[PDB]
Design a protein around this ligand. Structure first.
Ligand SMILES: *[C@@H]1O[C@H](CO)[C@@H](O)[C@H](O)[C@H]1O
Ligand SMILES: *[C@@H]1O[C@@H](C)[C@@H](O)[C@@H](O)[C@@H]1O
Ligand SMILES: [Ca+2]
Ligand SMILES: [Ca+2]
Lengths: 55, 251, 183, 108
């Protein structure tokens, strides 16, 4: 996996509840958070599968 | 909502609940029988639009009292000007597949005329922001609709009062508290900012963003709806067109 | 449009005018005033003046703290500047007093002058408004003095002078000296 | 102090010029005056007719809902859809059971 993968989840300033996936390095596994909906960082996916694919 | 109260059942009857497959997404504002106004970023990477439902007359999420009306959003309209995953021009106009029935528990908020909005409403100090959003920044979302009253700021004062975040444009306005005590939060996007005037309530803002929720030295940022009344009215009179997701020219 | 500067409150016995600069060139002004939590109220609509009378607004509640702002316009939010905060009760200046009469010890009487504050369409006096916050100082002629929480001095026998004072004040504590009187 | 006294001592009556307009009463001050105005006037000099600013930016022109300014003429008042303007020409009254921005509960 790429570097971004070490980056903490980024919910951003938007106040929507987008359930997204991120990779927990600590855990060395993908997990979920609520993205606000704008200014998403690279460690943030639509699903486990492509997150897992990616990190 | 951070530091509000439960909005007494039926006292925020224009308040809408947007869900995607039964899960809470954002709020909305009924401005008539088949149109709801929300936030442009609520629609980020939504893939199954057949599951996107608007609920009217809703109050307590833990139970179904029977006053709730649910409708599939037939169409999501945003300005051609909104760039995906950003804050500028945060607004959407949702067309309900079938109209809701007006009841004691389901009433639209008045969309005002732009000069009314700008000459008078923007100078009314407090307005109510509501939702089923987070009770605290990293807290849990409410089961019962919350309502909060916040004071508005002209952008220069907001800037000055802010600890030195995206840019606050002409399409936005700040409202709230800089003491980390009251604001809107995650789960309230799309929700109304409603101003009381001479006995009538009017839509003035849309829940949008903030640098956290009720963060010291920060205010909640709302979409400045007055900027869009005309775009919104042309669309409600426009003959209905096909796409599910439409990015209409703005102005 | 240029932005108004040097916003200053001019207030005497509650008569209150906000003054600014600069003199306008192809630009107009409008004033907005409010209390911490109330609505903004527009005054002196698109004025070429560099002053705005706000008495009518501030007498509504002399105890409240006001803020007004001056908006500038060519002759999207306006270009504006905020004024110092103003609490009428605490800062209005005390107007020049007046000896009403005096009589022979001597008994001196100071007039209870009216202010810009109205209660059911009638002007209130200094006493109506400050109650016991108001005290007076007599000066007689080497010179002497006397203070009361009333409008009378009972001295020992002449020229006298009076000055109104709100000792409880931090700003604008004393009025000017009234025109002197002599027997 | 004595300087304040002396300044005071040697000042004249700024009211000599009869500045208070329209029924107003001038009261002399130290190198200034105050104008006590009649209820329908305001201003430093009582020059302002509280009566002459029926425009839309002035308390919504006294309209309940919408206000339209008009050159060479009086301002117009109007209402939202589901509402009708009254004979008074400033007020709006609902034309539907469920007019926008009315809370049935609070109303009933
Ligand atoms: C009468 O006198 C005062 C004293 O300065 C002056 O300021 C006014 O303009 C005038 O009418
Ligand atoms: C002074 O004050 C104003 C209010 C009017 O009453 C005048 O007639 C009076 O002399
Ligand atoms: Ca329910
Ligand atoms: Ca004088």
């Amino acid at each position: 996996a790429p570097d971004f993968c070490l980056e903490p989840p980024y919910d951003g300033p938007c106040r929507a509840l987008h359930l997204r996936y991120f990779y927990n390095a600590k855990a060395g596994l993908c997990q979920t958070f609520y993205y606000g909906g704008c200014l998403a960082k690279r460690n943030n996916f639509e699903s486990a599968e492509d997150c897992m694919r990616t990190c | 909502i951070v530091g509000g109260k439960v909005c007494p059942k039926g006292e925020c009857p224009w308040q809408v609940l947007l869900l995607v497959n039964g899960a809470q997404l954002c709020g909305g504002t009924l401005i008539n029988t088949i149109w709801v106004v929300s936030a442009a970023h609520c629609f980020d990477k939504i893939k199954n639009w057949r599951n996107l439902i608007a609920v009217l007359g809703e109050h307590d999420l833990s139970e179904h009292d029977g006053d709730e009306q649910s409708r599939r959003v037939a169409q999501v309209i945003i300005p051609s000007t909104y760039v995906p995953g950003t804050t500028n021009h945060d607004i959407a106009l949702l067309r309900l597949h079938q109209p809701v029935v007006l009841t004691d528990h389901v009433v639209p908020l008045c969309l005002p005329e732009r000069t009314f909005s700008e000459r008078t409403l923007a100078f009314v100090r407090f307005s109510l922001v509501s939702g089923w959003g987070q009770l605290l920044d990293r807290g849990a979302t409410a089961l019962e609709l919350m309502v909060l009253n916040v004071p508005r700021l002209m952008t220069q004062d907001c800037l000055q009062q802010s600890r030195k975040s995206p840019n606050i444009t002409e399409y936005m306005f700040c409202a709230g508290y800089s003491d980390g005590s009251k604001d809107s939060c995650k789960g309230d996007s799309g929700g109304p900012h409603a101003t009381h005037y001479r006995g009538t309530w009017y839509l003035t803002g849309i829940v949008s963003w903030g640098q956290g929720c009720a963060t010291v030295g920060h205010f909640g940022v709302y979409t400045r709806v007055s900027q869009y009344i005309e775009w919104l009215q042309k669309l409600m009179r426009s003959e209905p067109r096909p796409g599910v997701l439409l990015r209409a020219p703005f102005p | 449009t240029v932005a108004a500067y040097n916003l200053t409150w001019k207030s005497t016995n509650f008569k209150t005018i906000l003054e600014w600069e600069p003199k306008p060139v192809n630009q107009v002004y409008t004033v907005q005033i409010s209390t911490k939590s109330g609505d903004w109220k527009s005054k002196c609509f698109y004025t070429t003046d560099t002053e705005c009378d706000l008495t009518d607004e501030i007498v509504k509640d002399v105890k409240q703290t006001y803020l007004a702002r001056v908006f500038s316009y060519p002759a999207g939010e306006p270009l504006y500047e905020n004024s110092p905060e103003f609490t009428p009760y605490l800062e209005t200046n005390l107007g020049q007093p007046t000896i009403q009469s005096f009589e022979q010890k001597v008994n001196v009487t100071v007039e209870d002058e009216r202010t810009l504050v109205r209660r059911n369409n009638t002007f209130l006096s200094l006493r109506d408004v400050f109650g016991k916050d108001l005290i007076y100082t007599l000066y007689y002629w080497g010179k002497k003095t006397a203070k009361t929480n009333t409008n009378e001095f009972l001295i020992d026998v002449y020229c006298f002078s009076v000055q109104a004072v709100i000792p409880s004040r931090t700003v604008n504590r004393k009025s000017t000296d009234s025109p002197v009187e002599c027997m | 102090r004595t300087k304040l006294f002396w300044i005071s001592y040697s000042d004249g009556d700024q009211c000599a010029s009869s500045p208070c307009q329209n029924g107003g009463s001038c009261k002399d001050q130290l190198q200034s005056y105050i104008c006590f105005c009649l209820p329908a006037f305001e201003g430093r000099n009582c020059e302002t007719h509280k009566d002459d600013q029926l425009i839309c930016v002035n308390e919504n022109g006294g309209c309940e809902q919408y206000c339209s300014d008009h050159t060479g003429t009086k301002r117009s008042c109007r209402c939202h859809e589901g509402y009708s303007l009254l004979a008074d020409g400033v007020s709006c009254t609902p034309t539907v059971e469920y007019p926008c921005g009315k809370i049935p509960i609070l109303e009933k």
